[PDB]
Design a protein around this ligand. Sequence first.
Ligand SMILES: *Cc1c(COP(=O)(O)O)cnc(C)c1O
Ligand SMILES: *Cc1c(COP(=O)(O)O)cnc(C)c1O
Lengths: 403, 399
Amino acid sequence: EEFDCHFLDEGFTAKDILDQKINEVSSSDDKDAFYVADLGDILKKHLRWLKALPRVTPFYAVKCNDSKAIVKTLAATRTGFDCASKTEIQLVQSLGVPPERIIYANPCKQVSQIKYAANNGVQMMTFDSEVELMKVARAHPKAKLVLRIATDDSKAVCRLSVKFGATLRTSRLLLERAKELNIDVVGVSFHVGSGCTDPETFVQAISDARCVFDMGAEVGFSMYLLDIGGGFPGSEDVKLKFEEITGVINPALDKYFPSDSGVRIIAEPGRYYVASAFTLAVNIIAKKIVLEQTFMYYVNDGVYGSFNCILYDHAHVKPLLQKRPKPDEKYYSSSIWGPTCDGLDRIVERCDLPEMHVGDWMLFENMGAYTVAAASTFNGFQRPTIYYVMSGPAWQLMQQFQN
Amino acid sequence: MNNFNEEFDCHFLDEGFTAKDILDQKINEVSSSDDKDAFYVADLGDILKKHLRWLKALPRVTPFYAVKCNDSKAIVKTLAATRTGFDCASKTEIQLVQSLGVPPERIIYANPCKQVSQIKYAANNGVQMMTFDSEVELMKVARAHPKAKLVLRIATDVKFGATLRTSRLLLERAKELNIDVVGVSFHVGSGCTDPETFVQAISDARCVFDMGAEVGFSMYLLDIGGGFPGSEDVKLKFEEITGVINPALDKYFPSDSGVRIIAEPGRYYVASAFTLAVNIIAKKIVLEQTFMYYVNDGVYGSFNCILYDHAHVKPLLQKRPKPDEKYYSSSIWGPTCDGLDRIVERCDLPEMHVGDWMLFENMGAYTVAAASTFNGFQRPTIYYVMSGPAWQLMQQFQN
Ligand SMILES: *Cc1c(COP(=O)(O)O)cnc(C)c1O
Ligand SMILES: *Cc1c(COP(=O)(O)O)cnc(C)c1O
């Protein structure tokens, strides 16, 4: 099923296909959870990116969803790939992507994985520490390094301990140390992150990046690479939409990194490409009534599976009814639980739903990003099957991108 | 040492050597190379020691290992030879146990809320005993496994467990549907602070047994669940808990009644058998002087137990530091690019360097069982060891 893609007929949408599949299994007990993944939605996102950020080459953040179908579609589109590990580089290269379309954007890499990157021709890597420079000097001395700078997220849960990113002061010392070690630093990267309430944050990051560029010029480096990271929204169900962010980014790029300077601007979008492409259908496998009347529903995907995103990715999930609800239907306070025997495997603490029954389906939209990528087989429950769909016109568009 | 697939490969543990010595040897073996991937040493002899200890502490209670805690084939094979039962929650777990040769009468399907197709799989493969705590579950059993032997799971002091009031209604409803209810199960859970909770649970089970007798059921199976500690690094130790359980079992379920008592320990068997070695792969100094260490296992891997299992992890050095060695405030981070992939927020450590190893004891339970390959990082290699005397002990259990 990984390389199996189904046709999407004219006048149909991923939703219609989902409804059809649900109807077809209605008289049986084959009601495992499943995804419908519209590869055409990923192509749509790419067109939208090219239009909104014409100066920025997208490098898809593989970690967000490492589906071979996704990577193949994006590779056909000629986008780059941001890989954090040997396995991700192997996946991308296996599909035929040359090394110059890969950035190894992990600032803290095990020596053997740096060696793997060097052996396979991946030259560009990020870094934010002196020890990383020592490791690169030993294991990949001809690498092209991108300095990752810190970006403030005022809504992070742990604002004192920041995992990645050098301050400006540290950035100066790092550039000088790289010069001492005869290591080439070619640019600057930053990552604002998905939790971004104000687009001005991007402006600040771009300004800081320009500062580090100036620092590089002072130390004698030829810096050309600006990496504006990820965090762009992957669906319209957000307060701060993609186009508002890009409307604030493009003037900043024009001001701090004009095209005549020779800068090459890239980004590392992950969730932007894939979030809305996946819709998850789970089946209600068990039910309890608690006395006014409240309900507990048990479904066959949970926090150890697709909904790990609730804990790892700070996700909030909205259950949707497969069968439309009449205006007069009574809604009851309800909780939704995963299949595992763990008391913590709870998807929704409280929501309002009409009375549902075992065998009914619940749908979760925008489930592409940081869901299957982090699922486990805890308690022996297997990952939901993914059905990849693509229309004829979407395939034609992909062909155009291939030429 | 090198694995000859790790699943079924077991290494000998020589006389006078312990799991720690094997760990040191492996570390020494790779000291001059860059192959510094995280790895486990799993002492199957420790699991056999736990079984002997269980037999002595709870002589009336047959243990059914909770496979979900650690589904290692090596573990299940060792426990299967030991003749324990298995508590299975899904088709895959039942498949694993049966593949190793365990007959269905040594399997309890102790998931109260089962998908119909999973119930069907159990019926197809002869697993008759299942738990339940709801009327809807009874409806599903009547359709998909009508000859099952049902065990009523009762609540103890949100997700599972019927109240006594609900238990009465469930027993009557099961009688209406001609479904056989043979016993009661409860699960106190690991975070139990007061052992008296077990006494109340056993008393509640006795009440539900009496309720079953009133409606005409022959109740014989008492399942006291799990939650027993898997290490000595706990406030409430195993033997204190069993000291409170055994008098209650004698009072509420005397042997002459014909009751069969089982338990579902998971972490008790496996927690202390696994020691994890991770390598420091990156390092930062933050200016008095504090350090950030990055290791090659994290919250998406073995340390998912921090979020899923409320685990508190203690990093250990390979060699005990000198008393006057300088310690620094330090943080420990996982390998993934996620900002949340942090193992230790703050601890005191001597200055360490890239290539040094950090050890984590009592990492057997709810660690590898829930690890993912997020960001492409592979699950740590597990090296299984067993001494000759441990193998001899396993033979005695088997015969
Ligand atoms: C996670 C990550 C991304 C992708 O983030 P999204 O929110 O999915 O766009 C991009 N760059 C880096 C360095 C990351 O760690
Ligand atoms: C998880 C579980 C167990 C095992 O719990 P431990 O804390 O590992 O002993 C036993 N019984 C049931 C019903 C469980 O869900």
